[PDB]
Structure formats: structure tokens, C-alpha cells
Amino acid sequence: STGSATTTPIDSLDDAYITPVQIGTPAQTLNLDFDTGSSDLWVFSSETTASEVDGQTIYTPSKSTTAKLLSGATWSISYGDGSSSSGDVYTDTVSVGGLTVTGQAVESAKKVSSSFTEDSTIDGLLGLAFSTLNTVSPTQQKTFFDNAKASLDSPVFTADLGYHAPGTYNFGFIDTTAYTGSITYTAVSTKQGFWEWTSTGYAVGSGTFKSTSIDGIADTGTTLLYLPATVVSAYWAQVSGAKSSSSVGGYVFPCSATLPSFTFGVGSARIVIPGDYIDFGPISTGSSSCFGGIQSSAGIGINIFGDVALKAAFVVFNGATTPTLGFASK
């Protein structure tokens, strides 16, 4: 089997991407944030505290003939950005782009933090990291990909995120028309439950490539590119007037700037992030200070290849017995 679904930016900045997902019988379609940095599929629901719902589409398990309470199971998750959610669990039928999993754990939120409430466009998350990070207790549950894997034509999914445009998540096949040149594969460590890999270095603009190992995670659920302070300083030093602002919470730059590109290494291959991808616009409405898309990972504890980086590539998440990651230009 295979699946193919379009993923769409939630706003003009590509802050996140939503993908329609069919849950239950008859289908209830919710728009979920596919997140390769977590491993829970959770949704706004009929059980979500009413004051914490503001415009989201909810899953109502009582209206699904295939829903079953997973008795005694609870979940609770906290994300890197400080947001959180928790609740109980149903199993139900879940389909993505024509690919169907029966008995998928669908984690129903009883509580969500303010950032989720305030984002009316995201109806929940669909985790695509390794199932070892799944938070369901006392019986840990599998991700949608883990459940689908044995039925897939090939045990892979791909992320093809657009810059200010829709893109695609495919399951079970590699679309050879969706990228240019060849795909370069690189080793993955699953020790922390993430799609963790080591980039071979970077360049700023037309500058020389610096060969240096940068361990980090491929994370579709993180907006920005978070790298070591040395690398980030080297990038922003090439933008006149750019500075790190503790008051704003990272590097800002004059909105009048033309940003240089940023290249990262994948083995001997190179992925080029155009300068425009690194512009996240005014810090507040009408400001001439703009927020940077490359930020320091210092104090996160891990480097994160988020959407800013991933959307410059066609990315293969290879879930074979020994997982790997592939990157191609597009």
C-alpha cells in the first residue's frame, strides 16, 4: 500500500504545515501537524476543556462506529517550545492520503496549553518520530507510520515541504519526479527516539564550505533551523545590522536586508537554503525589525533541522531495519 497527502502552510510565514487526516467511521477529517520530532497522534476532541477550544475541528469518538476506549490509558506531552497537552486514548481507523491503519491509537485531548488553543488551524499532531517516544501509559502505543509499515510497498515516508506553498507527505514510495539529481542517504541514530543524523558542515552565502560535524534532528514540527552558536553567529555576521536580541528571543535583522543563503552538508552533497527562506518577517506588526529563521540551539540541548532546512529538500525518512535519512535538492 501507499498514501499521498498534500500538506499546506498554516499562514504566510510557513509557521507550520497541516495535512488532512481521516479518523473514524464515518470519517471525521481533522487537519494535523505532522511532526517527525514526536510520536503521539493527538487531537482536539469532544473531551477537550471547552474554554481551551477556539475554532479547531474536534474528533467526537461517540460518533465513530469504529472507536473504542483504550481502557486505562492516558497521555501527557510537553514540547520543546513549552507547549503541552494531555488526555485519554481511543483506538480507531485512521487514513492519510488513501493509506489506512486500523486500531491506531488516537489520543484525545482533555487539556491543551494556550499556544494550541490560540492556533485555530491545527486540530492536533501526528507524530512520526520513533515509537519509543510515545507518551501513552501504561501501555506505550505505536505511531501511524510504525503501524502502517509492514503493509507499505517500501518502509519509508517522504516530506516535501513547500516554501510559501503546499507540499506533500508520501507513505510507502519515493516519487522520483519530486526531486532533482540524486538522493544522498546518511546514517540515523535512534538512541534518543529522533531522526538524528550528522551534517557534514555548512556555508554562508557564496562563502567557502566549512567541514564540521553537526549532530541534529530532522524535525518537521519545528519551524526554524537551530544550530550551534558558532555557526549561527557566522551566518548573521554577513547581514548588516543583524543582532541577537534577548528581549525578542533571538537574532533579528533589518527588514530592508537581503539575506544570504545557507548551505548544509549531507555526506558529500549540499542542500542550499535560499536567503528568503530565512526571513520570518516583522517581529511585531509594522516593525522594521525582522525575525531570523536560523537561531542558536544553545540551551535547547540539541540541534534541530526544522522546516527552514527541510523545505529546501526532498527528504526520505527510511524506516527499514536500520533507519536512514535521504536528502535531495528539488
Side-chain angles (χ1 to χ4, degrees), residues 188-190 192-242 244-277:
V188 163
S189 173
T190 62
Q192 292 191 87
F194 300 121
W195 292 91
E196 188 171 1
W197 65 289
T198 301
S199 171
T200 50
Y202 71 99
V204 177
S206 60
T208 59
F209 186 85
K210 176 73 172 181
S211 293
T212 183
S213 292
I214 305 172
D215 295 337
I217 66 167
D219 185 0
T220 57
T222 291
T223 314
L224 306 186
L225 174 52
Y226 293 90
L227 293 172
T230 46
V231 177
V232 177
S233 183
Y235 178 81
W236 289 109
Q238 299 304 312
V239 180
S240 189
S244 182
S245 168
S246 51
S247 57
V248 176
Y251 281 90
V252 296
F253 68 93
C255 294
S256 62
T258 301
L259 297 177
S261 62
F262 184 87
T263 301
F264 65 94
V266 184
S268 60
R270 307 288 181 254
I271 299 295
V272 180
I273 305 170
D276 293 345
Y277 288 28

Side-chain angles (χ1 to χ4, degrees), residues 59-62 64-67 69-82:
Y59 169 58
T60 303
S62 69
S64 172
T65 58
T66 42
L69 180 73
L70 186 62
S71 181
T74 59
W75 63 279
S76 181
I77 193 161
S78 301
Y79 297 101
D81 68 353

Side-chain angles (χ1 to χ4, degrees), residues 115-141 143-148 150-190 192-242 244-297:
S115 50
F116 289 115
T117 299
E118 291 163 0
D119 188 355
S120 67
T121 69
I122 292 175
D123 301 325
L125 267 65
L126 190 149
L128 291 169
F130 293 87
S131 296
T132 52
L133 294 181
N134 176 267
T135 76
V136 177
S137 178
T139 308
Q140 188 171 61
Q141 301 294 303
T143 70
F144 174 82
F145 177 55
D146 207 342
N147 281 324
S151 304
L152 294 179
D153 290 359
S154 178
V156 306
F157 68 91
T158 64
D160 183 6
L161 302 178
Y163 167 65
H164 294 352
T168 306
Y169 282 102
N170 290 330
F171 292 83
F173 73 107
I174 287 158
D175 180 357
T176 61
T177 74
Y179 59 86
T180 59
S182 53
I183 306 179
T184 298
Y185 290 86
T186 198
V188 163
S189 173
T190 62
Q192 292 191 87
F194 300 121
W195 292 91
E196 188 171 1
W197 65 289
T198 301
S199 171
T200 50
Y202 71 99
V204 177
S206 60
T208 59
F209 186 85
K210 176 73 172 181
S211 293
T212 183
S213 292
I214 305 172
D215 295 337
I217 66 167
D219 185 0
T220 57
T222 291
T223 314
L224 306 186
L225 174 52
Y226 293 90
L227 293 172
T230 46
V231 177
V232 177
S233 183
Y235 178 81
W236 289 109
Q238 299 304 312
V239 180
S240 189
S244 182
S245 168
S246 51
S247 57
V248 176
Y251 281 90
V252 296
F253 68 93
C255 294
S256 62
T258 301
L259 297 177
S261 62
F262 184 87
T263 301
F264 65 94
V266 184
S268 60
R270 307 288 181 254
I271 299 295
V272 180
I273 305 170
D276 293 345
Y277 288 28
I278 299 161
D279 177 19
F280 279 75
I283 59 171
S284 297
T285 304
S287 180
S288 72
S289 182
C290 273
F291 198 69
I294 293 177
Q295 297 293 346
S296 180
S297 63

